[PDB]
Structure formats: structure tokens, C-alpha cells
Write a protein that binds this ligand. Structure first.
Ligand SMILES: Nc1ncnc2c1ncn2[C@@H]1O[C@H](COP(=O)(O)OP(=O)(O)OP(=O)(O)O)[C@@H](O)[C@H]1O
Ligand SMILES: Nc1ncnc2c1ncn2[C@@H]1O[C@H](COP(=O)(O)OP(=O)(O)OP(=O)(O)O)[C@@H](O)[C@H]1O
Ligand SMILES: Nc1ncnc2c1ncn2[C@@H]1O[C@H](COP(=O)(O)OP(=O)(O)OP(=O)(O)O)[C@@H](O)[C@H]1O
Ligand SMILES: [Cl-]
Lengths: 95, 95, 95
């Protein structure tokens, strides 16, 4: 499993969220942040199975891209376990 | 060492914080976030020794759980080093 | 590549940002958070090449340190890939 953390322009959030839901993303966490003299940005975090990482990365790139400076970056971070709070399910059963 | 990132319902924050302090957690970072059409959630991050991860996970699950949809998830992420800013202490000496 | 996540006192943000830019940091993401009964803190995230991690850690420690309790902590988290949204560049080409 991997955590995909993407920092994008705020106005791109609904489009990116819609695109991710469309390819099957079940959950996502959004944080208001600032970055680069700081400009507002939106952080999106999604945790997915290893075999789904590339599709998510390409979907975020294609949907959040404007071609202008400041479009943002995506970081792929390893996740060793995932636990669903409601049920105690883990790993594959919790994504 | 591992970072435990948990996304929980906002009203569960004081209970979860109290439960974590009770089992010995020295520090925690809380961020206001939104998730799933987005609903407010609270992100808690705690970095702990490998041998303390399971106790923290079980404590968050038991305290944040309501049995209803939206209870949240917990992600376990590897941390290669930890540094205490005040002293420069690292690793085991900084947790 | 590694993600350096530092939680610091809010008033230290401009100094730390200036110090990081000075040693060559191209980008950084800042989040308003609370921590420890919670006090406001600022989270800074920077993703850098492995050979630049120590310089960044020392720069944050030296600039954010006051010697008083609450100065904060720095976590070093592995990053498996980085993607520049504007161009699709990855890894070394995206930092
Ligand atoms: N190295 C980094 N570490 C942490 N956060 C970063 C880093 N680089 C970028 N970010 C985050 O991504 C946001 C958008 O950055 P940005 O789109 O400018 O990337 P870039 O390297 O400048 O490529 P571009 O030429 O398209 O601007 C930054 O404001 C910051 O929030
Ligand atoms: N895959 C994910 N990636 C990133 N964040 C997630 C992911 N899944 C859940 N979250 C975060 O956890 C929050 C709560 O999710 P939630 O409790 O609905 O998990 P779930 O999979 O729906 O299980 P449940 O059936 O109990 O709802 C979401 O709003 C989001 O902020
Ligand atoms: N173990 C931890 N897990 C997650 N976040 C932490 C942890 N420890 C500290 N933090 C974050 O760092 C912030 C500042 O902590 P702090 O400076 O008090 O570290 P410390 O261990 O108490 O060392 P000091 O004696 O200098 O206070 C905390 O408020 C919290 O936001
Ligand atoms: Cl992380």
C-alpha cells in the first residue's frame, strides 16, 4: 500500500476529486495548506494498493495540470499498514 | 520508529487524546482536515517506538469507534529518524 | 529522496523559511496545526535528495531552537517517488 500526497492549486480540487472517484478511489483526506511568499494550496492524501498507484498519479497529473508554474507535486510514501476504525479491518480489507 | 496517522470524527478528539496520554504518549500533532461531499475530520499524528505501535492503534480504534460509517482510518508510516529541536537529541532519545 | 516534516513554533516560520531558501530549498508546504492543552504550531514539509537531508535538519534545528520546551520535532520519512505536476518530471528531475 502507498500514500499518495499531492499538493495542488485550490481551484483544481473539485475536478481532481471527481476524477479520482471516477477511477474508483474510495476515500481521500484534504488539508488547506500554503506553499511555494506563500500561496494557498490544497493537499490531498489518498492511500491505495500498490497496483493502483500509477493510475492515481496519472489521473492527478492530467487533471491538476495547467502548464503554469505552481501546479504542484505528488509524493509517493510507503504505508506499512492501514486499519479501518469502524471495524478493525486491516490492509487489503481496510482500503 | 513509526508515524501513526489517524483520521477521526472531530468530536472524538478529546477522548482519543486522553486515552493516548493515559497509555503514555508524550506528543501529538492535530490538523483540521476534511474527507470522505467533504465532512470535517481531525487528523492526529503520533510518532512512536516500533514496540508501541500496536497499543496505540488499538487505543485509537477502541476510543474513536462508533460503529457508524465515517469513523476513519489509521495509517502506519515508517519514520527513519526523529530529531528533538530543543536539544538535538535523535531517535530513541527524541521520542 | 526523503520528506522532512518539522513541527515548529509559529513565530519561527519566517526565519526557518529564509534559512531553508538560503541553503537552496526549492519548495515547502506549510500547515497550521496544534500540538503538545493544544498550542498552535506550524508544520513544514520539504522533500529533498538523500544527500541534502542532514543539512536541512541542521538548518531547521539551529534556526527553530529557542532552548525552551515546545520547540518541536523533525521526522524523516522515506519518499519512493516525486512527480512534478506541470511537466510529469519525476525523481531527481522533480525536486
Ligand atoms: N520540495 C518540496 N517539498 C515540499 N513541498 C513542495 C516541494 N515542492 C513543491 N512543494 C509543494 O508543491 C506546491 C506547488 O509547487 P510547484 O507547482 O511550484 O512545483 P515546482 O517545482 O515549482 O514545479 P512548477 O515549475 O510547475 O512550479 C508548493 O507550493 C509546495 O506547497
Ligand atoms: N483511502 C484513503 N485515503 C486517504 N484518506 C482516507 C482514505 N480512506 C479514508 N480516509 C480518511 O478517513 C476519513 C474517514 O473515512 P471512513 O470512516 O468513511 O473510512 P471507511 O473506509 O468509509 O470505513 P467506514 O465504513 O467505517 O466509513 C475519510 O473521510 C478520509 O478523511
Ligand atoms: N511523538 C510525537 N508525535 C507526533 N507529534 C509530536 C511528537 N512529539 C512532538 N510532536 C509535535 O511537536 C510539537 C512540539 O513538541 P516539543 O517541542 O514539546 O517536543 P518535546 O519532546 O516536548 O521536546 P522539548 O523538551 O523541547 O519540548 C508538539 O506540540 C507536537 O505538535
Ligand atoms: Cl507522511
Amino acid at each position: 500500500m502507498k500514500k499518495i500526497e499531492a499538493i495542488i492549486k485550490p481551484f483544481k480540487l473539485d475536478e481532481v476529486k471527481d476524477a479520482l472517484v471516477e477511477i474508483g478511489i474510495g476515500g481521500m483526506t484534504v488539508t488547506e495548506v500554503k506553499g511555494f511568499d506563500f500561496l494557498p494550496k490544497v493537499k490531498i492524501e489518498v492511500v491505495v494498493r500498490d497496483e493502483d498507484v500509477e493510475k492515481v498519479v496519472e489521473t492527478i497529473v492530467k487533471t491538476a495540470q495547467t502548464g503554469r508554474v505552481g501546479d504542484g507535486k505528488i509524493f509517493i510514501i510507503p504505508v506499512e499498514d492501514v486499519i479501518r476504525i469502524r471495524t478493525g479491518e486491516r490492509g487489503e480489507q481496510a482500503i
